[PDB]
Design an enzyme around this catalytic site. Structure first.
Site, PDB file in Angstrom:
ATOM      1  N   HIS A 140     -23.916  91.142  18.266  1.00  0.00           N
ATOM      2  CA  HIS A 140     -22.765  91.232  17.375  1.00  0.00           C
ATOM      3  C   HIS A 140     -21.513  91.656  18.125  1.00  0.00           C
ATOM      4  CE1 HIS A 140     -20.831  91.611  13.505  1.00  0.00           C
ATOM      5  NE2 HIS A 140     -20.440  92.841  13.791  1.00  0.00           N
TER       6      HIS A 140
HETATM    7  C1  LIG Z   1     -14.751 100.730  20.574  1.00  0.00           C
HETATM    8  C2  LIG Z   1     -16.164 100.362  20.201  1.00  0.00           C
HETATM    9  C3  LIG Z   1     -16.581  99.039  20.284  1.00  0.00           C
HETATM   10  C4  LIG Z   1     -17.884  98.696  19.941  1.00  0.00           C
HETATM   11  N1  LIG Z   1     -18.282  97.406  20.024  1.00  0.00           N
HETATM   12  C5  LIG Z   1     -19.543  97.049  19.696  1.00  0.00           C
HETATM   13  C6  LIG Z   1     -20.013  95.645  19.775  1.00  0.00           C
HETATM   14  O1  LIG Z   1     -19.244  94.734  20.154  1.00  0.00           O
HETATM   15  N2  LIG Z   1     -21.278  95.375  19.432  1.00  0.00           N
HETATM   16  C7  LIG Z   1     -22.130  96.331  19.020  1.00  0.00           C
HETATM   17  O2  LIG Z   1     -23.297  96.002  18.716  1.00  0.00           O
HETATM   18  N3  LIG Z   1     -21.775  97.637  18.921  1.00  0.00           N
HETATM   19  C8  LIG Z   1     -20.530  98.052  19.235  1.00  0.00           C
HETATM   20  N4  LIG Z   1     -20.150  99.403  19.137  1.00  0.00           N
HETATM   21  C9  LIG Z   1     -21.103 100.419  18.684  1.00  0.00           C
HETATM   22  C10 LIG Z   1     -21.323 100.277  17.183  1.00  0.00           C
HETATM   23  O3  LIG Z   1     -20.084 100.488  16.497  1.00  0.00           O
HETATM   24  C11 LIG Z   1     -22.357 101.278  16.685  1.00  0.00           C
HETATM   25  O4  LIG Z   1     -23.618 101.014  17.309  1.00  0.00           O
HETATM   26  C12 LIG Z   1     -22.513 101.195  15.171  1.00  0.00           C
HETATM   27  O5  LIG Z   1     -21.242 101.413  14.548  1.00  0.00           O
HETATM   28  C13 LIG Z   1     -23.511 102.231  14.667  1.00  0.00           C
HETATM   29  O6  LIG Z   1     -23.553 102.195  13.242  1.00  0.00           O
HETATM   30  P1  LIG Z   1     -24.016 103.491  12.405  1.00  0.00           P
HETATM   31  O7  LIG Z   1     -24.013 103.131  10.938  1.00  0.00           O
HETATM   32  O8  LIG Z   1     -25.269 104.041  13.043  1.00  0.00           O
HETATM   33  O9  LIG Z   1     -22.816 104.529  12.673  1.00  0.00           O
HETATM   34  P2  LIG Z   1     -21.476 104.478  11.781  1.00  0.00           P
HETATM   35  O10 LIG Z   1     -21.245 103.046  11.361  1.00  0.00           O
HETATM   36  O11 LIG Z   1     -20.393 105.234  12.512  1.00  0.00           O
HETATM   37  O12 LIG Z   1     -21.890 105.326  10.476  1.00  0.00           O
HETATM   38  C14 LIG Z   1     -21.311 106.606  10.231  1.00  0.00           C
HETATM   39  C15 LIG Z   1     -20.097 106.448   9.323  1.00  0.00           C
HETATM   40  O13 LIG Z   1     -20.156 107.413   8.269  1.00  0.00           O
HETATM   41  C16 LIG Z   1     -19.002 108.261   8.261  1.00  0.00           C
HETATM   42  N5  LIG Z   1     -19.419 109.673   8.451  1.00  0.00           N
HETATM   43  C17 LIG Z   1     -19.597 110.289   9.635  1.00  0.00           C
HETATM   44  N6  LIG Z   1     -19.977 111.581   9.462  1.00  0.00           N
HETATM   45  C18 LIG Z   1     -20.048 111.807   8.137  1.00  0.00           C
HETATM   46  C19 LIG Z   1     -20.388 112.958   7.267  1.00  0.00           C
HETATM   47  N7  LIG Z   1     -20.740 114.155   7.795  1.00  0.00           N
HETATM   48  N8  LIG Z   1     -20.337 112.771   5.930  1.00  0.00           N
HETATM   49  C20 LIG Z   1     -19.989 111.587   5.393  1.00  0.00           C
HETATM   50  N9  LIG Z   1     -19.669 110.502   6.122  1.00  0.00           N
HETATM   51  C21 LIG Z   1     -19.678 110.547   7.475  1.00  0.00           C
HETATM   52  C22 LIG Z   1     -18.103 107.833   9.411  1.00  0.00           C
HETATM   53  O14 LIG Z   1     -16.832 107.411   8.906  1.00  0.00           O
HETATM   54  C23 LIG Z   1     -18.804 106.673  10.089  1.00  0.00           C
HETATM   55  O15 LIG Z   1     -17.986 105.501  10.024  1.00  0.00           O
HETATM   56  C24 LIG Z   1     -18.831  99.754  19.483  1.00  0.00           C
HETATM   57  C25 LIG Z   1     -18.413 101.077  19.402  1.00  0.00           C
HETATM   58  C26 LIG Z   1     -17.109 101.415  19.745  1.00  0.00           C
HETATM   59  C27 LIG Z   1     -16.655 102.849  19.656  1.00  0.00           C
END
Ligand SMILES: Cc1cc2nc3c(=O)[nH]c(=O)nc-3n(C[C@H](O)[C@H](O)[C@H](O)COP(=O)(O)OP(=O)(O)OC[C@H]3O[C@@H](n4cnc5c(N)ncnc54)[C@H](O)[C@@H]3O)c2cc1C
Ligand SMILES: Cc1cc2nc3c(=O)[nH]c(=O)nc-3n(C[C@H](O)[C@H](O)[C@H](O)COP(=O)(O)OP(=O)(O)OC[C@H]3O[C@@H](n4cnc5c(N)ncnc54)[C@H](O)[C@@H]3O)c2cc1C
Ligand SMILES: c1cc2cc(-c3ncc(C4(N5CCCC5)CCCCC4)s3)ccc2[nH]1
Ligand SMILES: c1cc2cc(-c3ncc(C4(N5CCCC5)CCCCC4)s3)ccc2[nH]1
Lengths: 482, 482
Positions: free
Chosen positions: B456
């Site tokens: 992705h």
């Molecule tokens: C600049 C950048 C580029 C990237 N590019 C890629 C890519 O091209 N391909 C790829 O596979 N991955 C990429 N990643 C990594 C990818 O974004 C992560 O692997 C993915 O977002 C993880 O999803 P998640 O739901 O586990 O975390 P998140 O999607 O961050 O879930 C947590 C969300 O909940 C909210 N939250 C946090 N703490 C709390 C709390 N205490 N209470 C309530 N809400 C809260 C936050 O707003 C956060 O958005 C990238 C990351 C970055 C920083």
């Protein structure tokens, strides 16, 4: 409440949906913002939607255009090659819309789905079966709501890591870089991680007049953990595109300058002036504001301890995503979510396979990869075969960009033929590597590749083009046929 | 002489090498020219090298640049969008070099390889174990050499088919279109085949001022044999790029005009003036000048009859390539060659698998395909599931080209899950389809796709994105879930 999800991101959303949509359970989802942007950056949608893979892939496409307008001339496209310049304020406008459009979407998804509720705020564990939502990060803020439930999903993802170093408060992270009013004029991305390397290429495309991009990384070469061939090649190719990569350099302190500049002092004692300083040397789980001790949820090495089925350590409580401090990709958080829910609210439990995971680095050129690298594999496997082709494609022999080598590398356990890893560098390598990701899931052997009939002409046919290894690794040392 | 090869193309060369290189046999190779170009077009290297996949993929890249310079503006690239024009004479120059460079290469390959001899001329069978080489096509020309041998490989490939119709001698084929001094100003490509559709897009990119490209095809829709979704979409998208596609129209005669124009009369009675008329309605094996009857080699339906191991009907005599009138692709002629030689001069006989063959159409947008189509498959299989996603990717929602739908379509035998066909339309689809070609060789099921973890963001991740069929074909009729 059947389940409560802290974090409305890639991981949490995916399980917040599904669980409701397919198992008619009703669930609560917590995130902190709604739309992308300051001051929290990550809204509904998650890090990947608001400030991750989506917003950045648009910019990298935007950036890649630099190469087209230049290489077009080789195939006889002419124009006033003195009247061209890119407007960064534009590239931000289109970005914003898109994210907000995704933002505005998840909004409705809650409106119209029965058994799916969302509340704004900071959700933090309070007890084994109840979750609070304060008004702010601080665990002594205005309590918004108090949700009791049978199940929790921890999914708060990660957050940029800023080193303790002084003058730090003069450096930004990728977050603030999504919103730069002006584009940087002389910039330091810090780190060898993809995030650093991708932004390096963006910045280098929106470079003003006397512009220059500078990458620094404390180790020997960018992109640690990637096959060495890709690391060398991309290094040369970024160099060739006028990016300054400083290996074995790292900031000791950041000083604000006379005018408005920033003056960075490295360990080596080297001093350099820049306009922007973007940290990108890692991201840490967002476990603090969660306050898990109120329930007793085990932390470990920075990430929430979990087993094969995302079972934390407290029954009924669960964790997936960047918060687990494993491989932080969006599709991995999604696979983990869809599995969790099936196992928890369903008939057939399932666990996420964390192996053979295809991934891409959207540098310029980009990289697509799946599987093990020459090193590692040479150590888990008595005999290892390496199939390598490294040429400059026809289309680039003209064009001008003679330096744009395409690299295709299959590495295998030579004992049975099984393909251990494939590594690609060159245009569309991210598109190409996806298929092979399916191949490896099917335990393909090198013969499964070379027996497949190529698609001519492509870059991809190179994967079916190699029958005779370039070299072997026997018990860890490199060997060849005489 | 262990073997003699008529035709130094994709098929013949591949077996002329190998057989020598790996089995130390020595062989003779016959082609008619040396360098690309008039008057014979196909030189050493074959149709794909001199006037095929290689020269045309360069032009299609050249052409694709039209889309970049336009879509770049969306991501904020600005310039004098009134000072741009493409010079077709350039695009030909770079092409020529490349082909000649490949031409000049195969030259040396003969110089330096022991057990590999080449002679200029027209090689034609004379008797069961002897091949002549005249000076010309005519079987009563100056005999250049007279090669006796134990084995023959027929590999003369194909040649454009020009319909009997009068005024025909005012129309060209793809061949002469590689060498146009000027670019066409108003052009008729005739046929729905890829050749027609690809050149249609090239011509449309090098269009002069009041330029227009016109495609005609006697049937209902372009690209017959391809999945209907791709056919519809590409049709709309070519239209959207200002190509005129006339369905159910075919030339009855070609009249040379007052000035220099050509005036075409269709069956329908419609009359249209053009500057160029390029036939592309099929290619026929080059079996005539071979004169096989001198040995008794069986023709059938236009192509040289052959079995699973390329054994013709006369022992010791063999046939592969376009000359077999099957699927005329380069990699298929190569697979057939490498197999032939292994079986003939080796320890382990092998036969070419003609199924699940991945292929691409380099239109603009391009198409990548592997496997069966919705129709056919619905008739060989009691139950058929179709997984379809047809959206406009983010990057194109901006850009301007909102009309550029990406189409991903998996069709399966719903009885076990086995993937029967995958069909792609959209940028890089040719690169993407190659991997899946390996997947199908491995008899992948739809679950092997959707269990794979996506990359992705890509277009390709769409192949791992579909779990729930869009519709089914039960015993031939379309059905759905309520
Ligand atoms: C600049 C950048 C580029 C990237 N590019 C890629 C890519 O091209 N391909 C790829 O596979 N991955 C990429 N990643 C990594 C990818 O974004 C992560 O692997 C993915 O977002 C993880 O999803 P998640 O739901 O586990 O975390 P998140 O999607 O961050 O879930 C947590 C969300 O909940 C909210 N939250 C946090 N703490 C709390 C709390 N205490 N209470 C309530 N809400 C809260 C936050 O707003 C956060 O958005 C990238 C990351 C970055 C920083
Ligand atoms: C415009 C065009 C574009 C194409 N694009 C693609 C593509 O993108 N991908 C793809 O897979 N396929 C493509 N093809 C088809 C592809 O070129 C053929 O499948 C391939 O060339 C077949 O190889 P072959 O060795 O069987 O035939 P050839 O390579 O044609 O072998 C025969 C050669 O021997 C010589 N010869 C012929 N008759 C005699 C004789 N009597 N004596 C001595 N020498 C002789 C001829 O010069 C000829 O070049 C394209 C074809 C055309 C016309
Ligand atoms: C504009 C509309 C829009 C719609 C969505 C989705 N709707 C449903 C979605 C699905 N999941 C995971 C996120 C919870 C939903 C569920 C339906 C199939 C597609 C994925 S994604 C995602 C992003 C969108 N941007
Ligand atoms: C410039 C140099 C050059 C070299 C070649 C090849 N050399 C060897 C080639 C091989 N085959 C099939 C065609 C007979 C050879 C044999 C070596 C491995 C690559 C294919 S291709 C092919 C095209 C070339 N253009």
């Amino acid at each position: 409440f059947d389940l409560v999800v802290i974090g409305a991101g890639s991981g949490g959303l995916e399980a917040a949906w599904n669980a409701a949509t397919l198992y008619k359970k009703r669930v609560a989802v917590i995130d902190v913002q709604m739309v992308h942007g300051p001051p929290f950056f990550s809204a509904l949608g998650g890090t990947c939607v608001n400030v991750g893979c989506v917003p950045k892939k648009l910019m990298v496409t935007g950036a890649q255009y630099m190469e087209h307008l230049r290489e077009s001339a080789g195939f006889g496209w002419e124009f006033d090659r003195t009247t061209l310049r890119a407007e960064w304020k534009n590239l931000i406008a289109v970005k914003d819309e898109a994210v907000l459009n995704i933002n505005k979407s998840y909004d409705e998804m809650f409106r119209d789905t029965e058994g799916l509720e969302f509340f704004l705020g900071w959700g933090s564990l309070e007890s084994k079966n109840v979750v609070n939502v304060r008004e702010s990060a601080d665990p002594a803020s205005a309590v918004k709501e108090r949700l009791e439930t049978e199940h929790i999903l921890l999914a708060s993802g990660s957050w940029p890591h800023m080193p303790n170093i002084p003058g730090i408060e003069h450096c930004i992270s990728s977050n603030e870089a999504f919103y730069l009013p002006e584009p940087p004029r002389r910039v330091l991305t810090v780190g060898g991680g993809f995030i650093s390397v991708e932004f390096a290429g963006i910045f280098n495309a929106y470079k003003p007049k006397d512009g220059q991009v500078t990458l620094c990384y404390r180790g020997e070469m960018i992109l640690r953990g990637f096959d060495h061939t890709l690391r060398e090649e991309l290094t040369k190719q970024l160099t060739a595109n006028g990016i300054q990569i400083l290996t074995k350099e790292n900031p000791a302190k950041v000083e604000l300058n006379a005018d408005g500049s920033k003056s960075v002092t490295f360990e080596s004692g080297k001093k350099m002036d820049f306009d922007l300083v973007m940290m990108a040397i890692g991201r840490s789980p967002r476990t603090k504001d969660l306050q898990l001790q109120n329930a007793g949820v085990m932390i470990k090495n920075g990430g929430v301890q979990v087993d094969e089925y995302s079972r934390t350590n407290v029954s009924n409580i669960y964790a997936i995503g960047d918060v687990t401090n494993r491989v932080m990709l969006t599709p991995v958080a999604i696979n983990e979510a869809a599995a969790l829910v099936d196992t928890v609210f369903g008939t057939t439990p399932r666990k996420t396979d964390h192996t053979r995971v295809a991934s891409a680095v959207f540098s310029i050129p980009p990289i697509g990869t799946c599987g093990l690298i020459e090193e590692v594999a040479s150590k888990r496997y008595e005999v290892v075969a390496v199939y390598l082709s490294s040429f400059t494609p026809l289309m680039h022999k003209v064009s001008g960009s003679k330096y744009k080598t395409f690299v295709a590398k299959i590495i295998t356990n030579h004992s049975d033929g099984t393909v251990l890893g494939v590594h690609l560098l060159g245009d569309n390598a991210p598109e190409i590597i996806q298929g092979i990701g399916i191949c490896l899931k099917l335990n393909a052997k090198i013969s499964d590749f070379y027996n497949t009939i190529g698609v001519h002409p492509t870059s991809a046919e190179e994967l079916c083009s190699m029958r005779t290894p370039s070299y072997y690794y026997v018990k860890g040392e490199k060997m060849e046929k005489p």
